[PDB]
Design a binder for this molecule. Sequence first.
Ligand SMILES: O=P(O)(O)O[C@@H]1[C@@H](O)[C@@H](O)[C@@H](OP(=O)(O)OC[C@@H](O)CO)[C@H](O)[C@H]1OP(=O)(O)O
Length: 1086
Amino acid sequence: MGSSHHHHHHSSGLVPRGSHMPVFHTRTIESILEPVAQQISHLVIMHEEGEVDGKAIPDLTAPVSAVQAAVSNLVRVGKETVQTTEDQILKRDMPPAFIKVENACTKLVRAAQMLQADPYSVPARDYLIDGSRGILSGTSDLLLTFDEAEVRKIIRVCKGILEYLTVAEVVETMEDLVTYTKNLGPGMTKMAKMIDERQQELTHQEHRVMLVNSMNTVKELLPVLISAMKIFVTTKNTKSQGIEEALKNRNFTVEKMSAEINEIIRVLQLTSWDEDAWASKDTEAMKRALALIDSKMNQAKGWLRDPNAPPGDAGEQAIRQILDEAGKAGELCAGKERREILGTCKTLGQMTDQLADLRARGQGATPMAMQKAQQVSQGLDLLTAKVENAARKLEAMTNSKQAIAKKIDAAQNWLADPNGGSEGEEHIRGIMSEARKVAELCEEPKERDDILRSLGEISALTAKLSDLRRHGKGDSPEARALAKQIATSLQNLQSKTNRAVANTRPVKAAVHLEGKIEQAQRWIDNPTVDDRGVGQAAIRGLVAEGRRLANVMMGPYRQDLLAKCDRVDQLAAQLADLAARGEGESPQARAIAAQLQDSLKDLKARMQEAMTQEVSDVFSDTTTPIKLLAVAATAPSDTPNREEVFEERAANFENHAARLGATAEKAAAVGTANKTTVEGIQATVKSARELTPQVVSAARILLRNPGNQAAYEHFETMKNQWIDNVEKMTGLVDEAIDTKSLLDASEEAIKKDLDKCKVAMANMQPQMLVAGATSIARRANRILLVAKREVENSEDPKFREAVKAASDELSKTISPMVMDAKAVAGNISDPGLQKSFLDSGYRILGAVAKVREAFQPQEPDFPPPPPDLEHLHLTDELAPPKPPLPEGEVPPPRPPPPEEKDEEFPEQKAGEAINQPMMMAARQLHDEARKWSSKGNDIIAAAKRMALLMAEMSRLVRGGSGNKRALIQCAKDIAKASDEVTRLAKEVAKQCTDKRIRTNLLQVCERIPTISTQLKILSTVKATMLGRTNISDEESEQATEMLVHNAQNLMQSVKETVREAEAASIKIRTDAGFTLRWVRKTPWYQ
Ligand SMILES: O=P(O)(O)O[C@@H]1[C@@H](O)[C@@H](O)[C@@H](OP(=O)(O)OC[C@@H](O)CO)[C@H](O)[C@H]1OP(=O)(O)O
């Protein structure tokens, strides 16, 4: 190849974008590559038709022509694209892509002519895989470039309205305001329109939701940004004191919209899986932790200030709340920024025990004990401030990453197309600028110091390049030969930078509870790679939620909860030590797999149980507080205490709203829900936190302006936009708790809260009636809401009507506590209080309990059958002779078929070379489908085959033979299986009367047709790259990662179709056709 002595040595410049991923992230791209790879697999199985038999590879002027015919049209506009429209990045990128296309469909007709002439020809079996792969890589890169532009149009339009929200600060005159709407309007419909059209085209749903959610927030925040500018221009007069509550209600609206438009822009440039999501998740979580602390700080800084000793439940559990929530934040840190923060938690954790013991000893004013309570006060300051750090460092570190990305666009347009000017130069100053922010918000000696080196060297080159341009030499064999050298190090910058982001995110776990159990419950497999990591790191954040949950409880339950937390942790730290010994081999570690795997299963039941109570209490009244800020802020007339009363009602509203979100997370964290209802609830919780201040600012603007409507306009727009989050918060929270068990807690709550009305008279208070019917008012109104949700959700008229009935016989029974406790408010007129109050009020609890029974089994009855027929032993005399006049007589014959078996796993190990994640993907689907009989049940049947082929593909990858034709069939079979699962999973859902069960089943099983289509393409590829050429062998190492993470998804997404399919099996229609057989596998059901 190297065509001279001197020059061909330095020239390492075929290096713009020459080792790229394949992409199938749009319906167009998927539709093109699906057949291309279909066609190209033949020629990768014909290339193996000169190995097995070593035989002649037939006439290819028909196959390789229809191959050419496929990607012919694609360049017949792909050349007509590049010269026509003035796209700069399209121009330099479009050709070297389709130079590899035509390279192929040429290089397949050169090697076709080698075998058309000589059907035995190895100079073409040299150049067939190099010729094939080309057309795959080529068209991938060709279709990709074509798309990157369709996106660039959009990010353009978006970046525009990002820049146009800035000019919100330059808007003073009501005259100008409505001309802002005039010229914002048209440029938002085109964005929403551009986005909506683009989402349709997307394969990864994961993405389509982040888009669809983000752009909706944007729409619910014009009605607000519109408002906020009007109450900023309304307040331009000598009578407008608190003028800036508007300005910050208005800049909240501009920041959040801007953080959504940015989230949209980022999500749009996604071509594959998403690694940068997690940093916003954790960043949110710490804001959530900090917030909860911020609230409970002074409520327990007064604990330490005060010598007087109440060491129990009042504001000691206020201090340990902080220390749990700051412990939870430190968890989401990595390295030793984590170890410090948790290190401070266990120090100030024992200093409190030191004190709390000393407070029982009356030692409140002892000179060491006052001093020690001083230390904890200074401790919480430091710990709150050290979490406030790690929090904004994680946001700042990612904001810098998201900032480097949207610039490297035009930074590569400056660095090659050798003019740019001032306009282009700033794009590489800008990226260098951020690399320094990473390094100073990094916390290692050697991690920052390596970046400052890279930054120090791109500094020198970029100064040299800059001055050559300036002293003419901009067009020269030094102005390109160097400016080459830079784009190399400017890629190296994103390495050392992105590596610095990835070193501040720790071994992550499931966001939902039932996920976190699997990641742990999957220590039936005691020895494995990075399950020392994630297997503990779930169990770690499961007990750390048990601990978090017990620290806002009564002392009896509390220690009862921590007793389980500490004995589970103990049986897990046991096999943590036991497994590492040599292996946690079957004998001893069986003893824990009966105790811990069943113990950990009760800790859940104790966490949910409790969580169910804290939701039953806290969510009973979502509105009283902000409904008291309405009547407070309105201010019936004038008593100057108004300000201080509005504060106490506005503080009650912040105290309470903070509680709702803190509980809302606690249900997301520990309950029923999928990852989707958990994420749902969290966005809710994030908006409650954000909006709460924003309402009270508008609620202030009302106190200072008695008579204004424009103030009342902002109140109701904010007041409702906070409710429209809460009513939603409450929708996603009940959905994530057992309804049967919610109705228990709430019945038990109405019982206890009835007594407080019985013994409101027996004590004698007239309002403790009305406060003990603030409960049974909103509580009984909540049990009707919870049943109104379930009837909207069901399609089983037999259930639907039994609960629509027990609803009736309670909705009316709001009388004998509204206009009944209203009558005898003050009265103790014994006969005329209790004759209608207790009588009809305890039949209210009788109705509640009929509503409960409407959920309890409809079809099945109480007494089952025990069949004990004492089989005796009266012997049978069936004596066998053979008769005289005929000959040869016996029972029937035996054909080939068997008795019964079931093909369990070829669990490969002992000096074998496999893909360790791929097998571990395959062994996990098996485990789930292994549970169930495959006998009336092609879904389990399929699932079991799918996970068998995915163990073959695990052994059909590493090293590898001349079995490329095998890897094509293995992945061909896997696709065909998956299509059966999808066939059946749809028929199940279609028969299922529970809509949340149905919908969440279609959502996990409609992933599978695409995922398997991709797995086919990746399999047709990697085949072509199976131990071949030397430059090939650094692509064939990164190209597994895609296929690996693509196999992980299929096994996971099929595993959840199996479960949800069985789930949706149970609640099936009355006269329903399709039903598969769900029977757990026993010794007696194989
Ligand atoms: O290898 P692919 O992934 O493309 O699989 C295609 C599928 O339609 C598959 O179901 C096969 O169905 P088929 O019904 O054509 O099976 C062959 C048989 O009828 C006579 O030998 C195709 O052979 C097969 O298409 P083909 O006709 O190009 O071989």
